[PDB]
């Protein structure tokens, strides 16, 4: 797998999103700001900040077809950003009605609603009313017992998966009338009203990541125990066909993405994207996409003269501290499609706590 480092951000990057044309990306720095980056030849340039949040921004997402950015923060708010004709962005506060921080945000596949995970034991499913010119929030709350660490939407607009700090992965209906048309019958159910519970799958550690299969017929999720579990449902009120856990030898995956119906890429505290492959008969960790998993006299500049004396003075010796062998130098926080049709992701991007934004080609 080829990798290219697109940019190095000055501060940590728990989330990023590209637009549909991959011509700009938005990223959450560790502050209350969000950074918008545009192309600059083969490089990238900081086009503008957003700074409407009061406390640390936790997550950000960019809607492909409708070209809107949604942002979430420890200030308990969300803002939706929409493009004006003159090229500036219109902010819009969304009243999430959360008692604690917003922790994670995702746009729905039809982009008519988004969901915000929280530390408040609830998920704010947010949709727009043209009759009021308001974004309004519905709380999913019945089975959720702790911080929601991650969200994913089923390819049908109704079902929401959630990874939770109570060591469970939930599948919940986020069906909203006068936004959704009725969902088709599925392996998760057919009688599917708001906050109906399709699964409460267990984990060995906090569920950092969740992801539906490209067909929607299975859920992968990743735990803080350094495992990926893949769940194949049977029917409502019935146990799964298979509930396959693969246990990794590395530090935990924080993020997770189906490459196709039979393969998953995952990454996290191991600093490296891994590939898992399988089906309802069994799953295995099959490759590491970073070759760095294998642990792989002339004139001298003023900045080398000065830094070797600063290293002798501040540290033990002149010798510079070496890079980690992986491309990411710190945990890789998010893992997102970049190229190929849905069901056949050909390339994906990652961003990390080291501020690298990196493109990976399978």
């Amino acid at each position: 797998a080829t990798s290219q480092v697109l940019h190095i951000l000055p501060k940590p990057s728990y989330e990023h999103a590209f637009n549909s044309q991959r011509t700009e990306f938005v990223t959450t720095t560790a502050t209350n700001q969000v950074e918008l980056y545009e192309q600059d030849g083969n490089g990238w340039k900081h086009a503008r900040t957003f700074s409407d949040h009061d406390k640390i921004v936790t997550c950000v997402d960019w809607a492909p077809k409708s070209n809107r950015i949604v942002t979430c923060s420890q200030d308990r708010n969300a803002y939706v950003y929409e493009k004006r004709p003159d090229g500036t962005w219109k902010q819009t506060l969304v009243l999430l009605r959360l008692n604690r921080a917003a922790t994670f945000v995702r746009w729905s596949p039809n982009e008519d609603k988004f969901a915000v995970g929280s530390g408040a034991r609830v998920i704010s499913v947010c949709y727009f009313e043209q009759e009021n010119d308001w974004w309004v929030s519905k709380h999913l709350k019945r089975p959720l017992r702790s911080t929601i660490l991650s969200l994913d939407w089923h390819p049908n607009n109704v079902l929401l998966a959630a990874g939770c700090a109570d060591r469970k992965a939930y599948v919940l209906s986020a069906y909203v009338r006068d936004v959704d048309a009725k969902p088709e019958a599925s392996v998760w159910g057919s009688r599917l009203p708001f906050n109906t519970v399709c699964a409460e799958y267990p984990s060995g550690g906090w569920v950092h990541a969740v992801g539906f299969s490209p067909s929607g017929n299975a859920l992968a999720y990743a735990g803080h125990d350094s495992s990926v579990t893949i769940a194949y449902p049977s029917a409502p009120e019935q146990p799964p066909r298979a509930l396959i856990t693969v246990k990794l030898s590395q530090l935990p995956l924080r993020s997770l993405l189906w490459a196709n119906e039979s393969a998953i890429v995952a990454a996290g505290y191991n600093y490296s994207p891994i590939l898992l492959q399988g089906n309802e008969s069994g799953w295995a960790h099959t490759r590491d996409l970073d070759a760095g998993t294998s642990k792989t006299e002339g004139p001298v500049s003023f900045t080398a003269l000065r830094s070797t004396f600063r290293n002798m003075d501040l540290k033990g010796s002149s010798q510079s501290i070496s890079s980690l062998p992986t491309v990411h130098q710190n945990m890789i926080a998010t893992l997102r499609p970049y190229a190929g049709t849905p069901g056949n992701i050909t390339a994906f991007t990652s961003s990390g706590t080291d501020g690298r934004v990196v493109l990976w080609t399978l």
């Binding site: 830094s307 501040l314 540290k315 033990g316 501290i321």
Partner: protein
Amino acid sequence: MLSLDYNNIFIYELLTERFSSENPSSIDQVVTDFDGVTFHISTPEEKTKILISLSMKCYPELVNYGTLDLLKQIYGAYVHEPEMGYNFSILIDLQQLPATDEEKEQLAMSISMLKRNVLAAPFHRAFTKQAELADLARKDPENAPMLDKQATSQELMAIHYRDEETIVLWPEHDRVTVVFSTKFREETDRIFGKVFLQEFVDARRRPAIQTAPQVLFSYDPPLEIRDIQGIQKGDDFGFVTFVLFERHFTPQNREDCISHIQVFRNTLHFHIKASKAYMHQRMRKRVADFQKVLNRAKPDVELERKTATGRSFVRA
């Protein structure tokens, strides 16, 4: 300081001022010293006349060892009736001083030296009686063992000079032995004091200081002190013995030897304190070494240029 002064520095500086002063002001000054000793310095009837008085818990024992005779010999016409709550007193009249700056200086020194002068009488009694025993042993060398055996009990001085130290001493025809029945009650000073008392005795075994008094140490008492009242073999005391031989109290050296042996446990106590300041500088030097092991976890970034007050700078 590596060594303690023998005299009370306040009394020396105050009398060196007042013996020179054109216009003496009044004073009323209680002044502490080591070993629970205290002085009162005052002008109780005229600014012209200074009364200096010493309070010392062992003074009644010291009077039994010829102390008043030595204090009358040292201070002469300046001796005064004791002040209430004080054991000894001297009155100096600032219009009655010696005719020279050098006689005035050695009088200001002599009065500041008063704690070691009151405490010197048992040592002068031992040194002068060793000279009698030395002459008798020089008369009949085969009778000398019996003179030394009787002088070891009949000519022994014990001074319970503070509640955690007894100094015991006696003459024999060629020596004065003095034993410090010694203790530290503060627990960190007992722990550091074990190192100080051990290295003190091992120092005397090295070639460089064979000229010194013989030293011995234990923690039961030396045989000839085991039945002295208030010595006790289980009661956490160590026993530092000094054997002063005739060369350590020769006439050129008696008064320095007396001054220097009395301050033994005070130099040890002071250096057990000063060793903590040394350990603390030894520690914070290698806190600064461990900084450099954490500084290699800071990733390298250039800071913006700042003036000496920390204000931002806009050049280069």
